[PDB]
Amino acid sequence: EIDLSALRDPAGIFELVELVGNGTYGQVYKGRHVKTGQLAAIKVMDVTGDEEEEIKQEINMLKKYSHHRNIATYYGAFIKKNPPGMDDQLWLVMEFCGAGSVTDLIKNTKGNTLKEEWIAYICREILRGLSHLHQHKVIHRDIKGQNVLLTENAEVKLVDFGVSGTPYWMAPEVIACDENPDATYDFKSDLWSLGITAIEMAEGAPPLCDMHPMRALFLIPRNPAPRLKSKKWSKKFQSFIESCLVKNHSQRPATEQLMKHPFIRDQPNERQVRIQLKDHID
Numbered sequence: 001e002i003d004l005s006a007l008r009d010p011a012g013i014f015e016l017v018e019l020v021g022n023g024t025y026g027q028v029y030k031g032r033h034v035k036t037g038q039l040a041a042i043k044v045m046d047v048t049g050d051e052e053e054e055i056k057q058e059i060n061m062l063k064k065y066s067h068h069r070n071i072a073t074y075y076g077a078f079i080k081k082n083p084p085g086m087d088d089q090l091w092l093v094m095e096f097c098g099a100g101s102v103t104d105l106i107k108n109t110k111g112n113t114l115k116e117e118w119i120a121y122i123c124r125e126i127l128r129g130l131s132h133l134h135q136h137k138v139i140h141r142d143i144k145g146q147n148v149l150l151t152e153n154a155e156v157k158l159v160d161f162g163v164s165g166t167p168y169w170m171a172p173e174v175i176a177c178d179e180n181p182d183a184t185y186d187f188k189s190d191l192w193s194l195g196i197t198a199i200e201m202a203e204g205a206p207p208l209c210d211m212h213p214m215r216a217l218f219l220i221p222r223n224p225a226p227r228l229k230s231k232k233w234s235k236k237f238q239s240f241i242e243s244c245l246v247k248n249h250s251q252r253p254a255t256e257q258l259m260k261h262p263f264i265r266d267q268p269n270e271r272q273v274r275i276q277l278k279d280h281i282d
C-alpha cells in the first residue's frame with residue numbers, strides 16, 4: 001500500500017505532452033518519461049485532506065491489481081509539491097494506450113457500429129479483466145466504452161479505478177429508488193455495464209441515450225431489459241446480451257459463467273481479428 005507522504009515530485013521524471021481526455025476527479029494526459037522518451041498516460045488530480053483517502057485508494061488498486069494483460073499497467077505515483085495551505089497535484093502514471101478508447105473506435109467506423117467478430121474479441125478481453133478484479137474482490141463500477149482502451153497492437157485494457165453522474169451504464173440494483181432504498185454495487189453490476197457497452201459497440205450509443213440522464217435513471221429499474229433492435233446479429237450475440245442484462249442481479253450470471261457463454265468462447269479468426277483491429281487503428 002502506498003504512502004502519499006513518500007511520493008517524489010514528478011519533475012525530471014515524467015512530463016505532460018497534451019490533454020487526452022478526462023477521468024474520475026481529474027484530467028488525463030498523454031505524458032512522457034523524460035529521460036527515455038517512452039509515452040505514458042498521466043491522470044492529474046488536485047489533492048486535499050478531503051479527497052486524499054479516496055485518491056489514495058485509487059492509487060493502491062492500480063498499483064496492486066494491474067499485473068494482468070487486460071488492465072493498463074501501473075507505472076508510478078508522484079506529488080507535485082505546492083505552498084500551503086494550497087492544493088498539491090497528484091500524478092498517477094500508467095501505460096499509454098495509443099489507439100484510444102472503444103468509444104473513439106466507434107466514432108470512426110462506418111455507421112458507428114462494429115462487426116460482431118470485433119465486439120466478441122473486445123467483450124472477452126473486458127470480461128477477462130473483470131474476472132481478475134472480481135477475484136481480488138474489486139468492483140470496477142465504471143465499465144463503459146470510454147474506459148475500455150486499446151494499445152497500438154489492439155490489446156484491450158481497462159482504466160480508471162477512481163470510482164472503484166452519467167446513468168446510462170448503471171445496473172438496476174445500483175439505482176436507489178423506492179423499492180431499492182440501499183442501492184449498492186456488487187460484482188454483477190459490472191456485468192450489466194458490459195452488456196450495455198456491448199450494445200454501445202453494436203449501435204453507437206447505450207439504450208436510453210436520447211433521454212435526459214435523470215429520466216434514464218428513473219426508467220432503468222422499471223423498463224424491461226434492453227435488446228439489440230436489429231436482428232442482423234447472430235443468436236449467440238443476442239443471447240449474450242440477454243445474459244448480461246438480467247434485471248434481477250441474483251438471477252444474473254456470475255463473471256465466470258459469462259466467460260463460458262458461447263459468444264465469448266466460440267471465437268475463431270482471433271489473431272485475425274486483432275490484425276484487422278491493429279490495421280484499423282491507423
Ligand SMILES: COc1ccc(C#N)cc1-c1ccnc(Nc2ccc(N3CCOCC3)c(OC)c2)c1
Pocket residue numbers: 020021022023024028041043072094095096097098099100101104146147149159160161
Ligand atoms: C480516456 O482514457 C483514460 C481515462 C482515464 C484514465 C485513468 N485513471 C486513463 C485513461 C488512459 C489510459 C491509457 N492510455 C490512454 N490513451 C489515450 C486515450 C484517448 C485518446 N484519444 C484522444 C482524442 O480522442 C481520440 C483518442 C488517445 O489518443 C492517442 C490516447 C488513456
